[PDB]
Amino acid sequence: GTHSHGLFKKLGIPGPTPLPFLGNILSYHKGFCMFDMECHKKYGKVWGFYDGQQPVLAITDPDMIKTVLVKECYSVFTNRRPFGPVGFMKSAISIAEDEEWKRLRSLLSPTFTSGKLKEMVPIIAQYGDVLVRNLRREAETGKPVTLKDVFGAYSMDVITSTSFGVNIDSLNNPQDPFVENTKKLLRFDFLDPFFLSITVFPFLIPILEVLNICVFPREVTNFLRKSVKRMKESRLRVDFLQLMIDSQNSHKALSDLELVAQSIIFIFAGYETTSSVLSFIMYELATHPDVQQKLQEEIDAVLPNKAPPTYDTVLQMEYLDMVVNETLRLFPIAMRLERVCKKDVEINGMFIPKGVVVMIPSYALHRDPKYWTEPEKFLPERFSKKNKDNIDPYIYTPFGSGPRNCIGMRFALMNMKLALIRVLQNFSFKPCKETQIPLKLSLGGLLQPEKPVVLKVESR
Amino acid sequence: GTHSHGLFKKLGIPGPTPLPFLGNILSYHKGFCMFDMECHKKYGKVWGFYDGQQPVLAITDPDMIKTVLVKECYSVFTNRRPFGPVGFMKSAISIAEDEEWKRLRSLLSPTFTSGKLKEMVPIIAQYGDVLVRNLRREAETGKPVTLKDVFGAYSMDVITSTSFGVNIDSLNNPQDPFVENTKKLLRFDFLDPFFLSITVFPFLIPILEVLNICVFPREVTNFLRKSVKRMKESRLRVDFLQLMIDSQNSHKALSDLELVAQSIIFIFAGYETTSSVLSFIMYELATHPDVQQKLQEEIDAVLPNKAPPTYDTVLQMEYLDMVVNETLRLFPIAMRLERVCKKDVEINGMFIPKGVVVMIPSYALHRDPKYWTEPEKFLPERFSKKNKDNIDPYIYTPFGSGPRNCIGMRFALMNMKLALIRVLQNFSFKPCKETQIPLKLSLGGLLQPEKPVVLKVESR
Amino acid sequence: GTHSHGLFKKLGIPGPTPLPFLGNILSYHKGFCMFDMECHKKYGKVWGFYDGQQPVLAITDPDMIKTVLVKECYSVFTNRRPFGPVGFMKSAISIAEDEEWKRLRSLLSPTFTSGKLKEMVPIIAQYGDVLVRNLRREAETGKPVTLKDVFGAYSMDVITSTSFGVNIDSLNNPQDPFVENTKKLLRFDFLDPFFLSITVFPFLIPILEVLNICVFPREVTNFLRKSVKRMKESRLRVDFLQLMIDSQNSHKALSDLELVAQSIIFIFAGYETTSSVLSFIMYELATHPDVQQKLQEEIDAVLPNKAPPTYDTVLQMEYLDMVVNETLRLFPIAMRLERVCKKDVEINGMFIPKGVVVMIPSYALHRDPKYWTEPEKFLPERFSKKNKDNIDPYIYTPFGSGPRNCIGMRFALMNMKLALIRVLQNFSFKPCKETQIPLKLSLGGLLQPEKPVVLKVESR
Amino acid sequence: GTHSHGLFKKLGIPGPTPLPFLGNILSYHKGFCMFDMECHKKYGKVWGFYDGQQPVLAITDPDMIKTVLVKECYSVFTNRRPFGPVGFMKSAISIAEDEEWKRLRSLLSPTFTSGKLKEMVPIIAQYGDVLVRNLRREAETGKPVTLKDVFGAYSMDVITSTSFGVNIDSLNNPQDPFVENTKKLLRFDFLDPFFLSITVFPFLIPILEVLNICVFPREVTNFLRKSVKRMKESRLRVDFLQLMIDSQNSHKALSDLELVAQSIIFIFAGYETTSSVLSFIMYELATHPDVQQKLQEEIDAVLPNKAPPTYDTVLQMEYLDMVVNETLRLFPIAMRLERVCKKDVEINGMFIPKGVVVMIPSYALHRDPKYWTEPEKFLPERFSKKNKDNIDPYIYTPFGSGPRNCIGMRFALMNMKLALIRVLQNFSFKPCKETQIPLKLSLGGLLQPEKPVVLKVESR
């Protein structure tokens, strides 16, 4: 009931005090993000709490953070915490651990190079054209646009074609076989009934693992499993599947089911994340028409006459970059980074017992007054070539840092940027009566707007 | 490991001998139906086995059967066995038990009278017209027809409109909100991984009931729960919802959530059952064109010039009735009837300990040589007014018998008959090269064809 | 997590508000007794709380209490709550439920008549002689006496010989086979780690029931099971075993294992209960030498010259009775009486939903100022023939009331009285320096002294 | 249900075929030992089976065995399989794993040197004198002697005094506090109900670990935990406790609770093991009076006139050694050695997947005709300095081999030898009518006689 509940009181580490069995989870009634702020303010720089019986040690010192993410990554802090029954998805690089992770990490790093990415741009860019045509039809008829559905559909189209060559217009084909399953691959709400129970009955995982109950649905994983065995057997492009089929012709060649595992996790990592950030950005651009106009101006300069964006001209645009980064400062959608302490260690004047989840509260550091002037404000300027220098890369970590960081970072920024470019080239975006202002974050376990973002969309 | 595994060896009752923990479930590798036959042949008239640790006493004596289903129903054998975590669906009349069942049974019996049914015929009959139009378009283009999809869609249309007034053409609207959830309400395969585990880990039910994992999906039950709260609040027809909303204006008036519970179970009881029998019947009529022609002839006689069937002219047709009943003899899709023994009893020279599932092997009795001449053969004649007399109603029980029998019997026969009438009026049905002949039953826990039934469909 | 946690807020019933999963069990940090008082004071006459998810409705109205214990006992409130995995001890009359309880209750009522008891007095009385000899040897050498060990040994001797004819001097034979197991049969601490977990993981019971883990130890129950099969087979006295072997030569004759079940529960009900009350009484008599002297005087009057007590002269003694009853007022060692509500009901202007544990806080009513003048004080007089009249038998219930009350009441009072008589005849009892004064009740789940009672024991 | 059940059929490895859920455990109805022989004969040199879902790869090639036990011990095969909920005893060197094991292994190796052992001989030897006095009193009165009780008591006396300095005559004090708990520390029967369930519900371990249910009893571990905190605090000899208290004044000094953990495991490893081998040896010496006489002769030669054995004269005796070793050949009481495969590997032309329990069937190799002439026969000669050479130390492994072997080997042989010496010096031992001849091994999970060994004991 109190297993390890004296561990932090003992070691000298402060923090809220736990309740038996539940630990501190009642504190999650306002969300991971709000609880992390309060803990930063009211306890300082290091603190501890209990996800049920599991102690979690929050750390906020950039040198200490670097040690965990960078320095001792491979020796002490290699893995994230178990979070549910995962079945065969224990082979997805995100879930695999220790050496199996390192092998998967290596077998996949060449798939995410800039070269591989530059050759996917003409595919990603095609569904930007699709986006504008579907945006225009809703811009034609004066009717508010709900960003999450139009950007949701764009993200889906980008994934089907980048990882499977499946060329869909997911919006206009809302009944395709390939759209129904991939749309069931949403991000996990670790504050919803099931995942909370898993936290205070971690011993229920093995019970579930033996009933073959799985947090990745049996049908989705089954449909994609067989749908990929078709694609492999009809090919025998430039998409993730093929680069992976390539890398299996100094570690053990990528297995068959391991390739299926990665394709599904790429979807999981890329679907809701992308559409959610594109919507946050559109909210900020719609509530600061000066930033929007400025970006539209920077776009028309590089791309004269709605010229089509390319890998190289995308990377030209400084102010676009500043909008993307400043939006991810406010809304880092992972909320936290975490690693399991797998040994006893001392790092930066602090002993850490084997088994503690060490956690880095990204949302709260990105909104720390002590590192950010006027943190609540959308201020794209803080990332200009002028100011970009005094930003610590261990305070601002929307993609994490170190060897276990987001292997999809460059792909995701290039995907979102292509979207925002082709959309601002043709449209302007305005607040509504119904446009929730100021926007409220959800109280749940996902960093998303309370109410969806809806906006007026006009044509240029 | 062997809890109660001597109970039948002791009492004197024969039967296969169990394995620890698993009981006799390895015997289910050929299906409930085949295992029940072998047990009838090789052990006689009474026998016992173990679904894991749970003893099941099979009985085949018509007097003994009557005692269980009819005589001592309310005192000893009131309930079916628990079969999964059910959540709020513990209020569906099928799952409720003891007095709560009797109340629900009474609060719903007037909803299934013949009067209420005769006023639903013009609704049911409308989607017969819809069936023929969709059948014709597939009969127009010479392309094999897969019965389960065209009869699947008809069954869905009949349910939406009979229980919610929702008027859909489910086939041509394969993307309606109301079709996606109700199509996820299929019959349970108690021989599939999950339900088998539930059988040898019955103690896993409470674990699941507390994670709110449920065998009726949370979304389906949630969508229908709210979708009904709309219909109640827009009404404030002749459909099940309204007759139920009626019966809540000597027992406790039907509750709100109890009404939601029944509407979903009516779907569960009526969707796959109906479409599966309609397909079995079409198989038999397509593999005996003499029966088919004879029925077409009996239909044209009562209904001159594709005249539209009515409640009364439907009940006119003897040979139609004989085809429906003879098909349900071969294919009684419940396979077994069961009741939990809730007390110790002696019935017909046999003591039965509290807790035994008493079970009646319908599939095997319907195909018993000792009651049926040439049981394997489709012989509609055995049910004519001439021969219908020497059929024991405790050997032939496709809808069960007694107070807990199928409260939807008359509705289901009238629904299927309306379908078969309007379809034979306009079409003839022929075997294919691909038409699996002879048809094989599935090895799983549902009584359905191994491979789907597909047939040539011509026009008259 | 909150299953039924709105049930009392809804029905209108007040009470502390629950925490998810745990309900109100954090409130048990001071004990059932103290929590029950606070709830009586601060919420009044009726209230509700949650043992995890299980709602418990406390009631304190004598008419309402009578309804539950007496009036609707057989129809609505027949059983106590499940409390642990019990294995075969589900046949002990205390644990059995509904009709199986009524049968066991009837098959055992004639074993507890006054006639049967009067013939056990010469056995019980013999080990009073044994008590005095062992008390004297500790009274001889001036050394404090720890009541729980000398009365513990007396209680054990009374049980072995009353239920099995086994004639031991448990103290001087602290290594007999028959003493080691029966001494492991102590009362359950429902506030200790295991039983608390059972309360907030009631779903863990079936898991345990299938590993054959049992709250009655496998060895104790096994030793006594075989040790009784010896006694049955060597007999083939006046003791419980024989009266039971008798009653199996209008319900089903007592089974073999059912007889073993009762013998163990008689031990469980009678061992720690008796020794604990004898010690409470000795504390009160030692902290009021006037009561003690008065009782010694009433004993010498009826029993001139340490004359040996008999059934009839035991029942002569009014003041003895008043001391026993007043001690059980302060220390009713069951603390609460409970029944499961098995139907919906209205009783005395109150609706009660099926499934609620209805609970009667005996400890708090016995110490209610509103029924007892100076409740904290040991006042034997309130039970004299003069005052015994205005005591409601539904406020003062140390043995419960109604058909499910203590079937061992008369036996227990006669056993304790014989002890107290033969001991006061020969000894006087005095407070020590170490004698905890005032005595503190344990904070756990058993009503016993914090620290053991130790006292000076002199000879007469 | 069949998780990994194709792993051996796939890899090419033969073996009995499994049943769902249970694997091959029905095969354990004759015991680990008999099942291991049949598997050696009927499948050859390598085979696989399933303890439920857990694959176990048996290996019998001395080079392959050496690789696992010696060569790749620290890299691949460091740990034994989890076997039950162990609580804090996860710190006992036997249960600890990976580096924590290596640290414990090092912190304890100097406690088992020959120097430390030679200084414990005068303690061990003292309770040999105690043994002879208690043996004589049973040899005085002509009454069969049950070896397991007289050698059981000797083993207990040797442990209390070697690990805690507690100087008991456990037999004549069968009621000491320190004897009652340590006698509850018997070897685990992994074929008894509980441990078998753990094998096919390994997921039940975490459920138990959270109810603090433990396979080392809470009371035994609690009594010894506090009883050691006394001994530490009264000291602040030459016994295990002190050598351990010593080693905590290049790894982390032995913790407090870690020291308590080791003391209990030393008891667990040493109590039943020793007494069981001493009894096997006495059986063999009593059923071959020529060996016995020969040993008595070799003892009288080194120790003239019942001279007292010393470390050095104990190691003098070749024929004693040959009797001890030949008895452990027949009866290697661990039965199997095992290690978990923690990586994928190829060793001696064989790939082994991560997670397989690799197992070495000691009992069956010790009785392999292909390495042992007349294996069923007790032939002390095979271990003489003449023949001891062609015995492979990877076929004959009564204490295992390699870094994880029995850290108590020398202590155990010296303890048993001192016993056998002082006993044969004074007694001769003869078969009885009741002496089970030939002796049968138990069908359970412990290598012990079916029926106890009883023998005539005469004096010299």
Ligand code: HEM
């Ligand atoms: C705006 C979009 C995205 C954001 C903000 C984001 C952020 C993150 C973060 C914070 C992590 C954990 C980093 C850490 O623990 O240090 C992560 C991991 C990961 N992400 Fe992204 N991500 C995005 C999109 C994508 C995309 C398109 C992919 C496509 C392949 C992807 C694949 C992954 C993978 C595989 C990991 C786990 C890597 C490993 O365990 O070695 N993510 N992401």
Ligand code: HEM
């Ligand atoms: C061909 C179609 C159908 C067949 C063959 C069939 C057969 C059965 C059988 C064998 C039982 C159990 C009988 C027993 O235990 O004695 C049953 C129960 C039931 N059926 Fe039907 N059924 C069909 C369609 C329907 C329909 C359309 C409804 C619509 C309301 C329905 C509602 C129910 C209910 C509520 C029960 C449980 C009744 C109770 O527990 O009191 N069924 N059915």
Ligand code: HEM
């Ligand atoms: C001072 C000693 C004792 C006290 C204070 C005591 C008190 C109680 C109480 C409060 C109950 C529950 C009553 C209820 O729910 O209304 C009970 C039940 C019971 N007691 Fe006693 N008890 C004592 C000794 C004994 C003895 C010696 C026996 C010997 C047979 C015994 C046998 C039982 C049984 C069998 C029940 C359950 C009866 C049933 O469920 O029908 N008890 N006791």
Ligand code: HEM
């Ligand atoms: C006749 C008596 C004994 C026999 C036959 C015996 C045999 C064994 C065997 C086969 C093993 C496992 C070896 C392996 O996996 O390679 C073992 C382990 C062990 N034994 Fe002994 N043993 C005996 C007595 C003792 C005694 C007196 C001690 C006292 C300390 C002891 C302490 C241990 C320990 C601590 C281990 C685990 C070592 C580790 O995991 O590193 N044993 N024993």
Ligand SMILES: COCC(=O)O[C@]1(CCN(C)CCCc2nc3ccccc3[nH]2)CCc2cc(F)ccc2[C@@H]1C(C)C
């Ligand atoms: C839900 O919180 C945001 C989130 O989903 O973060 C990840 C999921 C990480 N998962 C492998 C489980 C690890 C345990 C965990 N419990 C958390 C609760 C709150 C906050 C963070 C938590 N971490 C992080 C890495 C990752 C790796 C992939 F391969 C695919 C998707 C993702 C997402 C991220 C891209 C948005």
